[PDB]
A paper describes a structure:
In the midgut of Ae. aegypti mosquito, procarboxypeptidase B1 (CPB1 or PCPBAe1) takes on a different role in pathogen infection, interacting with the DENV-2 envelope (E) protein/virion and impeding viral packaging, maturation, and release from the midgut. Based on sequence analyses, PCPBAe1 is expressed as a preproprotein, with a signal peptide (Met*–Ala*), an N-terminal pro-region (Ala1A–Asp75A; “A” to indicate the activation unit or pro-region), and a C-terminal mature peptidase domain (Asp7–Phe305) (CPBAe1). Here, we report the crystal structure of Aedes aegypti procarboxypeptidase B1 (PCPBAe1), characterized its substrate specificity and mechanism of binding to and inhibiting Dengue virus (DENV).
The activation loop (Asp75A–Asp7) that connects the pro-region to the mature peptidase domain is disordered and could not be modeled in our structure. One zinc atom is present in each molecule of the structure and forms pentahedral coordination with the catalytic residues: His68Nδ1, His192Nδ1, Glu71Oε1, and Oε1 atoms and a water molecule. CPBAe1 contains one disulfide bond (Cys133–Cys156), which is the only conserved disulfide bond present in MCPs. Moreover, CPBAe1 displays two of the three cis-peptide bonds (Ser193–Tyr194 and Pro201–Trp202) present in mammalian MCPs. The globular N-terminal pro-region occupies the wide active site cleft of the mature peptidase domain, mediated via interactions with residues from the substrate-binding pocket of the peptidase region. Residues Asp34A and Phe35A from the pro-region make contacts with the S2 subsite residue Arg70; this interaction is crucial for blocking small-peptide substrates from contacting the zinc atom, and thus maintain PCPBAe1 in its inactive form.
Numbering used by the authors:
A (entry chain C): 7 to 305
B (entry chain A): -1 to 78
């Protein structure tokens, strides 16, 4: 079970490598890029078949949001190690999952500072790190992103200044029009949100995304009774430019683009105790599977 | 071998009672990078959470007092 403890980055990549060896007909593991400090940013591709719609799922762009990589890892475990229980999202759907976008920051939050958020790439003489979810090149730097190098929402020296966000960009762009569902896992707050992050004006196809997002919230409510708030980002969060969901929607042209804020726990919300991981990732997968199924029915 | 010390740090919970009160929290976050906002939304009844270093605690609370916001000290000592 990957849902009993928070895994370090090397354990995550070792788990992926094991899956690539154990399931060579179902799974391929590849390097999408290399972090600033030299760590391998890997994806796992599940059920690759010509003509399939692709779900791209990433997590761990923000270092301290530990329940998101755990949820991504649990999703991988269900789809790969329990595929017979998940055929409804494995017929015409291919999954590409990036369980940790920001391994340098993630490891730093384990070793030194539990509440670290950014990358670790130096930004000048005084501080290190960029907010990866303010670093994507769509209306970059226009609102809700700090210009201060040491702020936790620092937008970066330029758009896509971080190899970690370039890795997300390259991995998504490699799908060459086949990606129909982009899903980014964060914490915390129990929200299922969609573009625009940077403005309150609704996108023209917001209803299609809302249909998917409501399906995830509904499935979660029917499974555990937990409530999720669904809507366009600015309904819940103050406007911010440079998020990955905005970029996937507008630049990668992914019709369904969603950011999920996973349940909080522990004294900080970001740090549910390890004993609570299983129930959170189990419930989260219920919503994620239901959104993918809706996408599978639409494409 | 060595990790960041959180000695003397506190976490405060704030529940804004209007969109204007929540906006005050947003300006505080945007203008004071030394504060660590763990959570901040526009959701009614939601609790914002802010981790505050000892050097910032008196000034931060006075800003809360100045604007009439309700707050609670939810963690008194993060303890290193
Ligand atoms: Zn986040």
């Amino acid at each position: 079970d990957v849902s009993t403890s928070y895994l370090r980055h090397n354990e995550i990549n070792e788990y992926l490598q094991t899956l690539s060896q154990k399931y060579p007909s179902l799974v391929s593991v590849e390097e999408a890029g290399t972090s600033y400090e030299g760590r391998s940013i890997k994806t796992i591709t599940i059920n690759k078949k010509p003509g399939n719609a692709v779900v791209f799922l990433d997590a761990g762009i923000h270092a301290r949001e530990w329940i998101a990589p755990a949820t991504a890892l649990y999703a991988i475990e269900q789809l790969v190690e329990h595929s017979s229980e998940n055929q409804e999202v494995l017929s015409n759907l291919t999954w590409v999952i990036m369980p940790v976008v920001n391994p340098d920051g993630y490891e730093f939050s384990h070793e030194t500072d539990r509440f670290w958020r950014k990358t670790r790439k130096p930004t000048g003489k005084s501080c290190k790190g960029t907010d990866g979810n303010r670093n994507f090149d769509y209306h970059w730097g226009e609102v809700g992103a700090s210009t201060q190098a040491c702020a936790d929402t620092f937008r970066g020296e330029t758009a896509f200044s971080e190899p970690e966000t370039r890795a997300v960009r390259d991995a998504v762009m490699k799908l060459k029009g086949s990606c129909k569902f982009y899903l980014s896992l964060h914490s915390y707050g129990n929200y299922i949100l969609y573009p625009w992050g940077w403005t309150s004006k609704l996108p023209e196809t917001w209803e299609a995304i809302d249909e998917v997002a409501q399906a995830g919230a509904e499935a979660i409510k029917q499974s555990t009774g937990s409530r999720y708030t669904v809507g366009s980002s600015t309904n819940v969060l103050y406007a911010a430019a440079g998020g990955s969901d905005d970029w996937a929607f507008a630049v990668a042209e992914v019709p369904i683009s969603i950011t999920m804020e996973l349940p909080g726990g522990g004294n900080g919300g970001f740090n549910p105790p390890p004993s609570s991981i299983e129930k959170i990732v189990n419930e989260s997968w219920v919503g994620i599977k239901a959104m993918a199924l809706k996408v599978a029915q639409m494409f | 071998p060595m990790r960041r010390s959180y000695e003397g740090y506190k976490v405060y919970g704030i529940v804004p009672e209007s969109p204007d009160e929540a906006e005050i929290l947003y300006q505080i976050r945007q203008s004071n990078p030394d504060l660590d906002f763990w959570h901040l939304t526009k959701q009614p009844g939601d609790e914002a959470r802010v981790l505050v270093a000892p050097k910032d605690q008196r000034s931060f609370l006075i800003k809360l007092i100045r604007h009439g916001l309700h707050y609670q000290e939810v963690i008194s000592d993060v303890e290193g």
